[PDB]
mmCIF file with all atom_site columns, C-alpha atoms in Angstrom:
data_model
loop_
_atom_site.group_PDB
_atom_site.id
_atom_site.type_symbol
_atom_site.label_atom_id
_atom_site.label_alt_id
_atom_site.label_comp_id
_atom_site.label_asym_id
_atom_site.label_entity_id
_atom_site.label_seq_id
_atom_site.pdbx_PDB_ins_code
_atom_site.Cartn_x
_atom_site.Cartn_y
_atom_site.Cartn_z
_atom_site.occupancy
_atom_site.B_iso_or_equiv
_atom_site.pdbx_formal_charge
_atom_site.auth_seq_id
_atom_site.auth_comp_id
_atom_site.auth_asym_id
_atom_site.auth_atom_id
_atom_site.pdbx_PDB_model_num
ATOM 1   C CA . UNK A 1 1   ? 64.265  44.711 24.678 1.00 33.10 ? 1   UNK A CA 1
ATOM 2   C CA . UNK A 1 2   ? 65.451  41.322 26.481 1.00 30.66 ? 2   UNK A CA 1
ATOM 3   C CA . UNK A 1 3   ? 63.160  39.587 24.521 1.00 31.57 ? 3   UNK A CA 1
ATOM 4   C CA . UNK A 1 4   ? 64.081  40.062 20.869 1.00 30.04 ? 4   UNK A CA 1
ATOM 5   C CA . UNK A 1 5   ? 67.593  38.637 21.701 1.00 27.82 ? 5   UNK A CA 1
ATOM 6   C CA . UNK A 1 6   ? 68.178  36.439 19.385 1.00 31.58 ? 6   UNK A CA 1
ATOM 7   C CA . UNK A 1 7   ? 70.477  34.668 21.982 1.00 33.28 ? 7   UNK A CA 1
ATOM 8   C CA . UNK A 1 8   ? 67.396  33.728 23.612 1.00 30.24 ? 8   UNK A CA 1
ATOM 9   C CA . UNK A 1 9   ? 65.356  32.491 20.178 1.00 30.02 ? 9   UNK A CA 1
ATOM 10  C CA . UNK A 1 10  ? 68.281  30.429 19.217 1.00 30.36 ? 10  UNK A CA 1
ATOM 11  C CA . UNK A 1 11  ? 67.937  29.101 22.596 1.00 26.80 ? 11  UNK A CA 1
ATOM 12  C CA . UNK A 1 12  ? 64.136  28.412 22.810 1.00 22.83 ? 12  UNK A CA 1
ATOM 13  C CA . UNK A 1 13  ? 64.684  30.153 25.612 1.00 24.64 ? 13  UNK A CA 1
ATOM 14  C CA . UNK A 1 14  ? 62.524  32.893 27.456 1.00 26.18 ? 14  UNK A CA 1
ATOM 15  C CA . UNK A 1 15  ? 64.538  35.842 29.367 1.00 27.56 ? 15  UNK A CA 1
ATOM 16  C CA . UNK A 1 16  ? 64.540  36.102 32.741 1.00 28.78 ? 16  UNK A CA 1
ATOM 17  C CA . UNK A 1 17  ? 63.787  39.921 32.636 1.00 30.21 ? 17  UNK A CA 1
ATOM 18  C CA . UNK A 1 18  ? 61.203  38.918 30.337 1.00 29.90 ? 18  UNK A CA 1
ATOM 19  C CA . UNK A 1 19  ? 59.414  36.230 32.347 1.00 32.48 ? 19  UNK A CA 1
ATOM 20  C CA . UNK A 1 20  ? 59.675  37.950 35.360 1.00 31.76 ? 20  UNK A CA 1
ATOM 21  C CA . UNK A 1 21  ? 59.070  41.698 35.056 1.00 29.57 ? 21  UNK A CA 1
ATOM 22  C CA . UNK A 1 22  ? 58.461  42.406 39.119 1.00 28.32 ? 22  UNK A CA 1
ATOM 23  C CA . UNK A 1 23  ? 60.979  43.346 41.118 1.00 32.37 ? 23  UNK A CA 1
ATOM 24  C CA . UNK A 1 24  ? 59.711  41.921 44.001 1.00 35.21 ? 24  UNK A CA 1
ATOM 25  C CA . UNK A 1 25  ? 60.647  38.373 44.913 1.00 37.68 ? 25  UNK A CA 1
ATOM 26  C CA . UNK A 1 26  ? 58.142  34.830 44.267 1.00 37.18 ? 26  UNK A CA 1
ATOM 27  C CA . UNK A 1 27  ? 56.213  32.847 46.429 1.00 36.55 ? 27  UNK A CA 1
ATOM 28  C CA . UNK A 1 28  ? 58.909  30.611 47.113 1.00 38.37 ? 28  UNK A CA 1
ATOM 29  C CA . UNK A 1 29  ? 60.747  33.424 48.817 1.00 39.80 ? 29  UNK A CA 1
ATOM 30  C CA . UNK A 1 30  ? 59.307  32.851 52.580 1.00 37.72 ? 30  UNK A CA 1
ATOM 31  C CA . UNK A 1 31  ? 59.311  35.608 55.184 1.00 40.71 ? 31  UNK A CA 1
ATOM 32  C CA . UNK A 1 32  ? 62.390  36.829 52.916 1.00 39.99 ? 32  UNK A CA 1
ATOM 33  C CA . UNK A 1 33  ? 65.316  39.190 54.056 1.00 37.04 ? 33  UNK A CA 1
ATOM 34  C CA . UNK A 1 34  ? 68.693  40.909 53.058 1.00 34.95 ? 34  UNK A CA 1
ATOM 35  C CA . UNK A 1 35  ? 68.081  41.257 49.141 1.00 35.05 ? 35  UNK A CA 1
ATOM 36  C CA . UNK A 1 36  ? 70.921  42.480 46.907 1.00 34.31 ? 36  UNK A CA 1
ATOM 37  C CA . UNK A 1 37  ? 74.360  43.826 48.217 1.00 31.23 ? 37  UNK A CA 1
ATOM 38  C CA . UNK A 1 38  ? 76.060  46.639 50.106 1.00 30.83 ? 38  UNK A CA 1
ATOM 39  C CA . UNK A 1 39  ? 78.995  48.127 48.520 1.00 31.30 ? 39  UNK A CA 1
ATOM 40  C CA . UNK A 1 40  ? 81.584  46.489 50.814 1.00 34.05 ? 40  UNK A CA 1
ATOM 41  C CA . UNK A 1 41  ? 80.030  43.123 49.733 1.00 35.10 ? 41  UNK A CA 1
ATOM 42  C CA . UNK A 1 42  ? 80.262  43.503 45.753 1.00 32.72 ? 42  UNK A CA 1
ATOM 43  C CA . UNK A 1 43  ? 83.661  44.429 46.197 1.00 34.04 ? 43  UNK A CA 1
ATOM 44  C CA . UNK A 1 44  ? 84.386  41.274 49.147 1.00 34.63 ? 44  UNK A CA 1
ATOM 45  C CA . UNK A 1 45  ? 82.760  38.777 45.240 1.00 36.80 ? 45  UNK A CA 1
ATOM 46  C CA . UNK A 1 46  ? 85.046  40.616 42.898 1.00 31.26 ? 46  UNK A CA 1
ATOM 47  C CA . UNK A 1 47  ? 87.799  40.467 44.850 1.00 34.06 ? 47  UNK A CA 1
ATOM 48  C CA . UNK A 1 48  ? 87.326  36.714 45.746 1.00 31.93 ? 48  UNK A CA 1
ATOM 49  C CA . UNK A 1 49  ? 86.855  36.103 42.055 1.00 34.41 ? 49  UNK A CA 1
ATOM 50  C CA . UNK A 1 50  ? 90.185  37.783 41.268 1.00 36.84 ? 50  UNK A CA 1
ATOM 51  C CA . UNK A 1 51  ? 92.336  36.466 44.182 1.00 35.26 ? 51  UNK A CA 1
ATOM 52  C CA . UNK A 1 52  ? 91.791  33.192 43.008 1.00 32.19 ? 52  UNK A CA 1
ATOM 53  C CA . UNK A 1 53  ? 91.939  33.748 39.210 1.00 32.82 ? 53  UNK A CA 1
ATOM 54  C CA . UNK A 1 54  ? 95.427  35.311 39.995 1.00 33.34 ? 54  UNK A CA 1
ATOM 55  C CA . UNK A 1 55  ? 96.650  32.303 41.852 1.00 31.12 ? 55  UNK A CA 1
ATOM 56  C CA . UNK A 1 56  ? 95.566  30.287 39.069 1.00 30.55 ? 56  UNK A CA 1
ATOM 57  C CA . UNK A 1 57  ? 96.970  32.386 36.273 1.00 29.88 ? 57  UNK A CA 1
ATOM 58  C CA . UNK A 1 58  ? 100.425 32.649 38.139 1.00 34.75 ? 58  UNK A CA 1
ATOM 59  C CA . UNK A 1 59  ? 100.375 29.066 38.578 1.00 31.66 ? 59  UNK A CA 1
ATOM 60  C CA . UNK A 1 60  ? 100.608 28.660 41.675 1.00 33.11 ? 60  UNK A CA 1
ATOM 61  C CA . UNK A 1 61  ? 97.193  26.293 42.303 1.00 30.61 ? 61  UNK A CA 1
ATOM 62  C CA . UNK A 1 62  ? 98.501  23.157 42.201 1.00 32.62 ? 62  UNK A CA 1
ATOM 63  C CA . UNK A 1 63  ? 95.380  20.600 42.461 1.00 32.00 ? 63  UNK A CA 1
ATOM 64  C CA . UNK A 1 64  ? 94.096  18.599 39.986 1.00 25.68 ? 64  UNK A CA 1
ATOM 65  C CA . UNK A 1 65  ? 93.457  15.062 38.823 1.00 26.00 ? 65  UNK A CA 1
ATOM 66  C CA . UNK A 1 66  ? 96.536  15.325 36.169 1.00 25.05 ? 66  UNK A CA 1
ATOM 67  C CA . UNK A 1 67  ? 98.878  17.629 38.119 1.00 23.21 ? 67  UNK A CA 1
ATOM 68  C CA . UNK A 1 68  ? 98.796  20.952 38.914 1.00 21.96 ? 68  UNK A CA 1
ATOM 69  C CA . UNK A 1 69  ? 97.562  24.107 37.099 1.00 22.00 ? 69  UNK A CA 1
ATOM 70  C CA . UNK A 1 70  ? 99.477  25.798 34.620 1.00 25.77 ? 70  UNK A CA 1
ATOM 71  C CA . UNK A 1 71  ? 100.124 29.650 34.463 1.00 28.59 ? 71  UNK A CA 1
ATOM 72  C CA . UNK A 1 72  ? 98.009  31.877 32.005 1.00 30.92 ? 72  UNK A CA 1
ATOM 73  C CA . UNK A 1 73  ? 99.619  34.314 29.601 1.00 26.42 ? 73  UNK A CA 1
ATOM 74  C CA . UNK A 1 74  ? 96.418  37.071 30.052 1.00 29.26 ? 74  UNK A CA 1
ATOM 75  C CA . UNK A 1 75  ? 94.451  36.585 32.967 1.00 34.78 ? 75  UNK A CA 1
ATOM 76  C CA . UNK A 1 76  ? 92.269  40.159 33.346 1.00 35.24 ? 76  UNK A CA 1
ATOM 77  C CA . UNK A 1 77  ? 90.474  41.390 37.056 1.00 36.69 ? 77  UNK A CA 1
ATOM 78  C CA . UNK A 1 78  ? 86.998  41.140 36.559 1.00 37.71 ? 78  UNK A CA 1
ATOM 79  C CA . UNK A 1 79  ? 85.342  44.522 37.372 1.00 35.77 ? 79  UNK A CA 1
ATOM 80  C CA . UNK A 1 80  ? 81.466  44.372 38.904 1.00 37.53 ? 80  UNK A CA 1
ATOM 81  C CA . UNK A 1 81  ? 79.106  45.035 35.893 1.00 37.84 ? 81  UNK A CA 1
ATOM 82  C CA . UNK A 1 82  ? 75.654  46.149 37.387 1.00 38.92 ? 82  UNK A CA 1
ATOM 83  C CA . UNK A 1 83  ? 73.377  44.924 34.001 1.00 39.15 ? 83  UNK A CA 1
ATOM 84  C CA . UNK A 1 84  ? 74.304  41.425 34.891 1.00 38.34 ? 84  UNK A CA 1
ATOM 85  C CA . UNK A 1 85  ? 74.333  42.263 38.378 1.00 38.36 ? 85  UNK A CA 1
ATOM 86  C CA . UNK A 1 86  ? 70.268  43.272 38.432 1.00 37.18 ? 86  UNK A CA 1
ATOM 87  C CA . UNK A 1 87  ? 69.745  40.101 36.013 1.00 36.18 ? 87  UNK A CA 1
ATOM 88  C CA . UNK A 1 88  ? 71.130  38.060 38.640 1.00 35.03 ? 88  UNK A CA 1
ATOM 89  C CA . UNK A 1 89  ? 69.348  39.400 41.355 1.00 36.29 ? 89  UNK A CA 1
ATOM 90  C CA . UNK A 1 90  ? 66.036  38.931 39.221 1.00 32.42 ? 90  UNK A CA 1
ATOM 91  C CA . UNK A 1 91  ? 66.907  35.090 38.969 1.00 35.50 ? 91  UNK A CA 1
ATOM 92  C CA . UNK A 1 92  ? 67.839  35.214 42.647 1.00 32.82 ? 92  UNK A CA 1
ATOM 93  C CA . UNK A 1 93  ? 64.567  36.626 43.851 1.00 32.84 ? 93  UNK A CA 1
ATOM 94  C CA . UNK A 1 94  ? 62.780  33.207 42.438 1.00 30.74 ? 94  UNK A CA 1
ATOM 95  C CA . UNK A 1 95  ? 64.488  31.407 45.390 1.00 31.59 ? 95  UNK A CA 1
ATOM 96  C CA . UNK A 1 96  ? 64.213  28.035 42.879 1.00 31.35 ? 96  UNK A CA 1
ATOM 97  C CA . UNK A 1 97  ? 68.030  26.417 42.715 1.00 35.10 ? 97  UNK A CA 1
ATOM 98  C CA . UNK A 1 98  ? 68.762  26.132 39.618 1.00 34.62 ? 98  UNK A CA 1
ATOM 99  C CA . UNK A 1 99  ? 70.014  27.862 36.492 1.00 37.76 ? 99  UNK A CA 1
ATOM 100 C CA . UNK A 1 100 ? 67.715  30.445 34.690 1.00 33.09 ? 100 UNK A CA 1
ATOM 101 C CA . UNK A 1 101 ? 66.627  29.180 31.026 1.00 37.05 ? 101 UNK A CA 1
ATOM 102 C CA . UNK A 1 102 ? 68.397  32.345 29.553 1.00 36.07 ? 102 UNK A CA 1
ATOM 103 C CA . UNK A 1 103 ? 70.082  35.693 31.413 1.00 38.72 ? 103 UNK A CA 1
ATOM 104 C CA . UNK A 1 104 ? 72.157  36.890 28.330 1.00 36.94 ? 104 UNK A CA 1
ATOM 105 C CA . UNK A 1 105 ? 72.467  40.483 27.060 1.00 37.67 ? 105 UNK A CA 1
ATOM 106 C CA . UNK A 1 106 ? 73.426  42.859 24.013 1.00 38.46 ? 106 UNK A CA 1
ATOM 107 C CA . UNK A 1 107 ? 77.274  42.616 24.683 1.00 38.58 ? 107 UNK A CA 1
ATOM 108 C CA . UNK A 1 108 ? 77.397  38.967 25.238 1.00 37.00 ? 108 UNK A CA 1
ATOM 109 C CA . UNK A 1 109 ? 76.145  35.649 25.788 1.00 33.83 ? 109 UNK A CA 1
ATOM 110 C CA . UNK A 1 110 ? 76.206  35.158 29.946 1.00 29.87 ? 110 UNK A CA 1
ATOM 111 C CA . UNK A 1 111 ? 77.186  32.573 32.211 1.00 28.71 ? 111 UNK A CA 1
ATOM 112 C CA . UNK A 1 112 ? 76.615  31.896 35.461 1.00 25.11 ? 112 UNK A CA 1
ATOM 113 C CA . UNK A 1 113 ? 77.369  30.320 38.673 1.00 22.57 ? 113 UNK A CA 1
ATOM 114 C CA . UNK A 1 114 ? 74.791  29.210 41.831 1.00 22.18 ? 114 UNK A CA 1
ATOM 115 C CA . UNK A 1 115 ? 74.881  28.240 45.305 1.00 20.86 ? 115 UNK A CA 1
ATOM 116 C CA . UNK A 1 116 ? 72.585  28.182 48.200 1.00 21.69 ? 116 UNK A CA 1
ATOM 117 C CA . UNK A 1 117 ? 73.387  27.479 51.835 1.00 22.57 ? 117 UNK A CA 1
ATOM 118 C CA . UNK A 1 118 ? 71.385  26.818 54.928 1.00 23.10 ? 118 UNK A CA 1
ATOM 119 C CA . UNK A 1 119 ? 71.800  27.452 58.727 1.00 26.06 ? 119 UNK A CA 1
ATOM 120 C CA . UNK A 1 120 ? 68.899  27.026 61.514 1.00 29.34 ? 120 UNK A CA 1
ATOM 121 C CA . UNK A 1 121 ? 68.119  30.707 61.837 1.00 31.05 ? 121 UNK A CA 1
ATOM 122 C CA . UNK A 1 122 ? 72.020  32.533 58.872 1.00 29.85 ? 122 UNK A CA 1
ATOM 123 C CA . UNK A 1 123 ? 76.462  33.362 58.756 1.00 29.12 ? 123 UNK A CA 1
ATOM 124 C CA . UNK A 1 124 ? 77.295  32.354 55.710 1.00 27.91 ? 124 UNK A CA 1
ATOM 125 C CA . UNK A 1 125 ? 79.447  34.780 53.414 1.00 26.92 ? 125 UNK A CA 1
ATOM 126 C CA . UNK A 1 126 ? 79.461  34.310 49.336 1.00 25.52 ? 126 UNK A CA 1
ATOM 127 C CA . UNK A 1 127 ? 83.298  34.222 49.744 1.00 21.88 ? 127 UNK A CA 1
ATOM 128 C CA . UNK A 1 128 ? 82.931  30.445 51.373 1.00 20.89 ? 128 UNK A CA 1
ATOM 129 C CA . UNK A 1 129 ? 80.250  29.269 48.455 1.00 20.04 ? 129 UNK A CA 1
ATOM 130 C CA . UNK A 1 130 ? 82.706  30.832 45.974 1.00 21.61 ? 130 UNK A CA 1
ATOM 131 C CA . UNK A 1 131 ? 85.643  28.733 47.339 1.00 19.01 ? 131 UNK A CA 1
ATOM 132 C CA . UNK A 1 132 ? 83.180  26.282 47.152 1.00 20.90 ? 132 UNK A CA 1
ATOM 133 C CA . UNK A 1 133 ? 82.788  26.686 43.284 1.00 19.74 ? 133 UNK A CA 1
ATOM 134 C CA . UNK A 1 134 ? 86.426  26.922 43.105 1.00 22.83 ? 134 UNK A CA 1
ATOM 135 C CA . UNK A 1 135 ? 86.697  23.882 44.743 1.00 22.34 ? 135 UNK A CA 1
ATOM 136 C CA . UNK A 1 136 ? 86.008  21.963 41.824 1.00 23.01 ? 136 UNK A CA 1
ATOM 137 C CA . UNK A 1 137 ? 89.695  22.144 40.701 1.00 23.94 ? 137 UNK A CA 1
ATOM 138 C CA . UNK A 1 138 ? 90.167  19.530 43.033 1.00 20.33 ? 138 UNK A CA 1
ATOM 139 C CA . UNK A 1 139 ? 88.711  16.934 40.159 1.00 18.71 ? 139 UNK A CA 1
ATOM 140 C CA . UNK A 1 140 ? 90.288  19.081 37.186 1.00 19.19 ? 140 UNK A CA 1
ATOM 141 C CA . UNK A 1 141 ? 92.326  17.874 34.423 1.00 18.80 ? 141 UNK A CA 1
ATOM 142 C CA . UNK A 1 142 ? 95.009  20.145 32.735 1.00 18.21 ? 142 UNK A CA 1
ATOM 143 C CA . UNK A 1 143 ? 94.210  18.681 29.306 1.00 17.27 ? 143 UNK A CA 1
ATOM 144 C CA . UNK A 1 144 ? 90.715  20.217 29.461 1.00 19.68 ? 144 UNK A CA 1
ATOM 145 C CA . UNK A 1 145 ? 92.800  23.959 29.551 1.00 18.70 ? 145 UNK A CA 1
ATOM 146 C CA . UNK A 1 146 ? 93.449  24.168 26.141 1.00 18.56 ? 146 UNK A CA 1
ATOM 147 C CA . UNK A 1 147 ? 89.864  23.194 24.613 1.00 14.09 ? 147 UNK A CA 1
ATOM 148 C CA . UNK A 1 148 ? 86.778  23.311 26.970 1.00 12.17 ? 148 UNK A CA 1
ATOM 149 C CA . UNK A 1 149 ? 85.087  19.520 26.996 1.00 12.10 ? 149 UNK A CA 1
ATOM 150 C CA . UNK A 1 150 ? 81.581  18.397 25.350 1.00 12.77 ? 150 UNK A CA 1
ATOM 151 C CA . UNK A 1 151 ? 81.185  15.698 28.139 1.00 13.36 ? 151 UNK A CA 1
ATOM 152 C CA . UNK A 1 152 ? 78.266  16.874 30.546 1.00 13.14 ? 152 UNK A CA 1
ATOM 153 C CA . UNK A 1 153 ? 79.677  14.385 33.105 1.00 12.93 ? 153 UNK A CA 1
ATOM 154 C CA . UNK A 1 154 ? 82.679  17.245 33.010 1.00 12.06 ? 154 UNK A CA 1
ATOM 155 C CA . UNK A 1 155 ? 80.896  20.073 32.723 1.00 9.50  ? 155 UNK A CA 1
ATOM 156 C CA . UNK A 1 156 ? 79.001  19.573 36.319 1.00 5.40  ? 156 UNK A CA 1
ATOM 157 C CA . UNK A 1 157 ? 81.873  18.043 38.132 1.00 6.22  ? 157 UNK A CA 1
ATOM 158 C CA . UNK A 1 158 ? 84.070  21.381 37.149 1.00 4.49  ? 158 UNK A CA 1
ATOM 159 C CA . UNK A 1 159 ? 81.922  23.657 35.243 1.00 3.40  ? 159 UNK A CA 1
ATOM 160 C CA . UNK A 1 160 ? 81.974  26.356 38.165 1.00 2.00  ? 160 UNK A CA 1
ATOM 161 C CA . UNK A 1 161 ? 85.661  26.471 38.551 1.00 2.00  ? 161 UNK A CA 1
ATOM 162 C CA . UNK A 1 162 ? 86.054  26.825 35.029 1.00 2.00  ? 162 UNK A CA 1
ATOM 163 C CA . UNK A 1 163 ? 83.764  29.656 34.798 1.00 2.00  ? 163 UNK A CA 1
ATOM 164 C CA . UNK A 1 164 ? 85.610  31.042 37.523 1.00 2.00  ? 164 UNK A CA 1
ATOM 165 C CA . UNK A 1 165 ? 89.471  30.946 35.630 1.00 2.00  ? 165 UNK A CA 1
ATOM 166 C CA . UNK A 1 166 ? 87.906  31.998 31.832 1.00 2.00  ? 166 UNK A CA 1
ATOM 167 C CA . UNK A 1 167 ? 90.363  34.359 30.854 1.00 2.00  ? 167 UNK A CA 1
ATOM 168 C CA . UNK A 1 168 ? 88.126  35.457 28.834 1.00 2.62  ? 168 UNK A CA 1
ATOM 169 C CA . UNK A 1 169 ? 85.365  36.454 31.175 1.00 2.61  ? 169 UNK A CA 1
ATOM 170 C CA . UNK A 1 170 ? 85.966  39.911 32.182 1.00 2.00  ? 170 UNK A CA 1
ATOM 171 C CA . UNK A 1 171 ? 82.840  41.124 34.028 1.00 2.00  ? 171 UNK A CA 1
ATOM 172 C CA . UNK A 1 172 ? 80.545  39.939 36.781 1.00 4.34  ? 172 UNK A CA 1
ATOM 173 C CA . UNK A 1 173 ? 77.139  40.375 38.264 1.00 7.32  ? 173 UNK A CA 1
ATOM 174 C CA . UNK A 1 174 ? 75.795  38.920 41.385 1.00 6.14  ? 174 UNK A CA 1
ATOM 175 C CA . UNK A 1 175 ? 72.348  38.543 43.197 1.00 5.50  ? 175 UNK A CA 1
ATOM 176 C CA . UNK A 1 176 ? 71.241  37.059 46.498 1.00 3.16  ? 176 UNK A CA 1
ATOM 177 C CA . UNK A 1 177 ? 68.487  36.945 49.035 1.00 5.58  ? 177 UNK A CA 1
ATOM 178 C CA . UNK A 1 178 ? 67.744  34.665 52.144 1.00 6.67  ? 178 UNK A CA 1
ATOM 179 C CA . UNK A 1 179 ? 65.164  33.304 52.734 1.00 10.47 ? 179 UNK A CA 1
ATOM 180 C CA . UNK A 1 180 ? 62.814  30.275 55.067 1.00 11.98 ? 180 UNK A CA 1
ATOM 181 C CA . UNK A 1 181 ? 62.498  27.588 53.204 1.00 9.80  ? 181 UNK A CA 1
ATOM 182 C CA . UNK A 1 182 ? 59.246  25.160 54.364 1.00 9.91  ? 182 UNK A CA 1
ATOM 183 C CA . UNK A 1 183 ? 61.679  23.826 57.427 1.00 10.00 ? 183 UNK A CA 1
ATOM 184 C CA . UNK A 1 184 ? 62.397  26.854 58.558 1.00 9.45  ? 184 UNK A CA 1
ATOM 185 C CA . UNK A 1 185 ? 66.050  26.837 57.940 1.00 7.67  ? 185 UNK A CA 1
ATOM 186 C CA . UNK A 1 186 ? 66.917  30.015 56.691 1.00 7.20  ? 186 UNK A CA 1
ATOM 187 C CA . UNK A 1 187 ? 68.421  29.132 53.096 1.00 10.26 ? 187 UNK A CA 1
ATOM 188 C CA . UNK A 1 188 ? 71.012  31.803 51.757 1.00 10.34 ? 188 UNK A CA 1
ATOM 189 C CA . UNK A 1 189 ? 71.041  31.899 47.664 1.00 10.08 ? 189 UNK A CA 1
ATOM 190 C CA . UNK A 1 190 ? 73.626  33.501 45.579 1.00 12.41 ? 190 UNK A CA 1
ATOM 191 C CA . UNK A 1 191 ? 73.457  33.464 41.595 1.00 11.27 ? 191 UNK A CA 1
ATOM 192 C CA . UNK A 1 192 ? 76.569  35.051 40.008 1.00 9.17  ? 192 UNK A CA 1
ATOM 193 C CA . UNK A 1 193 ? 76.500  35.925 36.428 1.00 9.67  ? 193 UNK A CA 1
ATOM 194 C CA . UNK A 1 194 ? 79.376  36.599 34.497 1.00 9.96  ? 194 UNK A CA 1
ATOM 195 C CA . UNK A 1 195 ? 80.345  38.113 30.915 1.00 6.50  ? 195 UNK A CA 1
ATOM 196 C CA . UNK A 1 196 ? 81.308  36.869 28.258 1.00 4.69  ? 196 UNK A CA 1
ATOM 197 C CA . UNK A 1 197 ? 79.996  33.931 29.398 1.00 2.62  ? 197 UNK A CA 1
ATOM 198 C CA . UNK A 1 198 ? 82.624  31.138 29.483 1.00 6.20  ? 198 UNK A CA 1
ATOM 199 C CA . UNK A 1 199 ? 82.789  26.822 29.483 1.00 3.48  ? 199 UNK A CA 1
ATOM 200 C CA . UNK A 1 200 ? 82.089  27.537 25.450 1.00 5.09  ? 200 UNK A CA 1
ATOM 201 C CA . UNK A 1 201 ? 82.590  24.126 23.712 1.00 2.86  ? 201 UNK A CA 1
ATOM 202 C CA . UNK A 1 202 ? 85.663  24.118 22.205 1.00 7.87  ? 202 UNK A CA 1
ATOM 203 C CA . UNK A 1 203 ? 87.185  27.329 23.620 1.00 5.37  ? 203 UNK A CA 1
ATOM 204 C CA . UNK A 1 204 ? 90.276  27.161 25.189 1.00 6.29  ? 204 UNK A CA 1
ATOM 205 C CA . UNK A 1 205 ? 89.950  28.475 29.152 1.00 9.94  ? 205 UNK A CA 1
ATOM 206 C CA . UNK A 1 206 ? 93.085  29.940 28.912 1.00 8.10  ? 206 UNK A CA 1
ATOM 207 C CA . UNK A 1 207 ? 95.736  30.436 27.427 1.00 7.63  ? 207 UNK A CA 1
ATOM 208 C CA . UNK A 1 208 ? 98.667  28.140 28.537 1.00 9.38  ? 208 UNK A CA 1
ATOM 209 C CA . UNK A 1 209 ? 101.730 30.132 30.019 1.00 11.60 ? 209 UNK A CA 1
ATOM 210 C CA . UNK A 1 210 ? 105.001 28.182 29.595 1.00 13.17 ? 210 UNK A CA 1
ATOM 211 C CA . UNK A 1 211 ? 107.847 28.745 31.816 1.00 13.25 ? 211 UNK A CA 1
ATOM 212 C CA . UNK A 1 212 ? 111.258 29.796 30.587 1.00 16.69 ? 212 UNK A CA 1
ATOM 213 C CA . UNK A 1 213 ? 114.617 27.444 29.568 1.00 17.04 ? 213 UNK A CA 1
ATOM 214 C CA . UNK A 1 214 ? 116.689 30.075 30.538 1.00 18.74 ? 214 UNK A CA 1
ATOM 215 C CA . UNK A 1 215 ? 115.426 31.244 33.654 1.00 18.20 ? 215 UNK A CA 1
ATOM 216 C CA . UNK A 1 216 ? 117.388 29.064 36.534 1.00 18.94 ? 216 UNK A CA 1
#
């Protein structure tokens, strides 16, 4: 099933689904708590997600090393998509920060975005470590809009803001759990995945809006 994608084999890569086929969370998950999502909270991500990718696409963010960001001529909502969504929570229940060696599926190679915050004993929403990922358009160029960089450097110093704006991303899928890590600081991990998975080499983000002569 997950492991005759051939996404993965190109990849040398072993599934997540794959690897781990127990629902219940590692070792590394100490004295863990508050697994997965209620409703109110899938819809609190997706709406995040779109809020901002709106405010981008009407271009209205104005950050950025070069200037400010343009508008987008199709900029869709992202609706929740639950496949991705169990994926991530698979790769969340590992408690290990860092990105999973493959989490792709039939439809469409997958991206994905991480974060993981900590708090002696834990109130700490995924809306603030998405604005966090967002964030990242802080140190964002315009010229990297129209064709998505090679440079790694790039890729980690904006890669989660640009996963965030891919116009062509139109679904996502999150997981998180908290958790004591050996201080005792309760750490609070969210993987998001998202589909079709976007920051593809060469691909433009989006696609650049340009406003009109004869509009004064």
């Amino acid at each position: 099933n997950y492991c005759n994608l051939q996404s993965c084999k190109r990849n040398n890569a072993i599934h997540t689904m794959c690897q781990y086929t127990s629902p219940t969370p590692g070792p590394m998950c100490l004295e863990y708590s508050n697994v997965g999502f209620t409703d109110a909270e899938k819809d609190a991500i997706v709406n995040k997600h779109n809020e901002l990718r709106q405010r981008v696409a009407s271009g209205k963010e104005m950050r950025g090393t070069n200037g400010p960001q343009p508008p987008a001529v199709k900029m869709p909502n992202l609706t929740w998509d639950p496949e991705l969504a169990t994926i991530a929570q698979r790769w969340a229940n590992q408690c290990t920060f860092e990105h999973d060696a493959c989490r792709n599926v039939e439809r469409f190679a997958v991206g994905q975005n991480i974060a993981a915050t900590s708090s002696s004993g834990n109130k700490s929403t995924p809306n603030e470590m998405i604005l966090l990922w967002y964030n990242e358009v802080k140190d964002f160029d315009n010229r990297w809009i129209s064709s998505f960089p090679s440079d790694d450097n790039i890729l980690m110093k904006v890669g989660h803001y640009t996963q965030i704006v891919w116009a062509k991303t139109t679904k996502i899928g999150c997981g998180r759990i908290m958790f004591k890590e050996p201080d005792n600081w309760t750490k609070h991990y969210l993987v998001c995945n998202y589909g079709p998975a976007g920051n593809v080499l060469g691909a433009p983000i989006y696609e650049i809006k340009k406003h009109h002569h004869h509009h004064h």
